[PDB]
Amino acid sequence: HHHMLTNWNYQLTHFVTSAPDIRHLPADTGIEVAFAGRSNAGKSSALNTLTNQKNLARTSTQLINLFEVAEGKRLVDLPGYGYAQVPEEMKIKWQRALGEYLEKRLCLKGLVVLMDIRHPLKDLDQQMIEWAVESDIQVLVLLTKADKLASGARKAQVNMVREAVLAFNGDVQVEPFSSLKKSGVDKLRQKLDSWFNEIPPQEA
Amino acid sequence: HHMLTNWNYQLTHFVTSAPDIRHLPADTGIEVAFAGRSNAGKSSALNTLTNQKNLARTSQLINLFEVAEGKRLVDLPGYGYAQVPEEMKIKWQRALGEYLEKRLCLKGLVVLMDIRHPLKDLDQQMIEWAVESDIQVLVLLTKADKLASGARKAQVNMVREAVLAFNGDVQVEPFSSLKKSGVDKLRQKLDSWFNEIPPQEA
Ligand SMILES: Nc1nc2c(ncn2[C@@H]2O[C@H](COP(=O)(O)OP(=O)(O)O)[C@@H](O)[C@H]2O)c(=O)[nH]1
Ligand SMILES: Nc1nc2c(ncn2[C@@H]2O[C@H](COP(=O)(O)OP(=O)(O)O)[C@@H](O)[C@H]2O)c(=O)[nH]1
Known about the structure:
The structure is a homodimer. By secondary structure, chain A is of the alpha/beta class. Chain A has a single domain, classed as Rossmann fold (3-Layer(aba) Sandwich), CATH 3.40.50.300. The first copy, chain A, is built from five helices and seven strands, in the order E-E-H-E-E-H-E-H-E-H-E-H. Chain A has helices at 43-51, 88-104, 125-134, 151-164, 185-196; strands at residues 14-19, 31-37, 64-70, 73-77, 108-116, 138-144, 172-176. Chain A has a seven-stranded mixed beta sheet with strand order 1-3-4-2-5-6-7, sandwiched between helices. The first copy, chain A, is globular and about 45 Å long. The A-B interface holds A 1-9, 11, 52, 146-151, 154, 176, 178, 181-186, 189-190, 193 and B 1-8, 10, 51, 144-149, 152, 174, 176, 178-184, 187-188, 191. Chain B: Residues 28-196 form the EngB-type G domain. Chain B: GO terms for molecular function: GTP binding; metal ion binding.
């Protein structure tokens, strides 16, 4: 029996813990893939769709939610940005905390940035991609709510964003996604499988 | 707007069995059939796809499973009838061909074969019947974990070259139920086939 690319079962992903900040994250070991986006972009719906769970994050918030796909393989749900009607001091603090996670989390292997296909690359979207590429993290951009566009317009948006992300000095993949129509889940699973194939040498 | 749906194969459930195509349910919706030599790894592949230990069984019945309303996986009884009388062998081989040629709702055939010994016994006849009936084929080279990466790729390339001889659409992929590898390729093919809704049912 020889090594092969594993297709992990994301429907067995389960909640393990939350953290109020990076100082209270679990040990910086294994593999993490992070998810981020503007509030309301569709991040919780995408995670719910990927894992076939109705309310994966157990929401009843700046909490970081962590989920295990398997031992040592975690999805990290970063609190949505934008911060409607928030004081400038808190906004800067919360934005910096996202950057600190991307730059200092040694077990981080990929970042999924979710953004509405109709309004991509707004608010902290570009800064999140830039921080990831500076830290040698591969990025998957999911253009969410892709069911709101007809096929021609959908492809035009995907192409526009693919052209735009060439300006980042790193590896940025762009895919349309719809939680509502359960479309694009395959592209997400393929990216996750590629990232969870990269076992830390000191743990293998 | 319409999009390519990624169906949840882990929710697949058993619907019915049938001894022959005359006792199958209504010839509507979409079926994708699975076939291979006995012991090639067909039940393991279906059980891996669906994350179920005993959905597909192995000890001449056709077994039908439903992914969603109108979308079915069809488990055809394995061929390579060791020590079966020649009369029964011919009849059971003909029954497989009759299903492929006469099932109007059939949209794809998955032929599973050991990566070490592809295209043996009824393998080529199953592919040929499918292409003659304008059915797309996915060949899964099973037990691919038994080969190192170089030899695995060499077998895949050799089978890809060989299936050019069939006058149809034949995709070839390595697969391992043991290592849970190649499941994405299978899901992609199934999703593509289940995207093709019969016009009279849309
Ligand atoms: N049309 C459509 N609406 C979506 C989709 N995903 C999310 N939404 C809607 O967008 C809103 C915010 O989604 P949610 O997942 O809670 O966003 P989050 O704040 O980023 O976690 C809700 O009204 C969802 O129903 C999608 O794929 N298609
Ligand atoms: N190494 C390995 N063995 C496998 C794989 N799939 C099936 N087998 C073994 O091959 C035998 C036959 O598999 P099975 O799925 O029962 O075959 P079927 O008769 O075609 O349904 C069993 O001993 C399986 O454990 C695989 O991917 N890798």
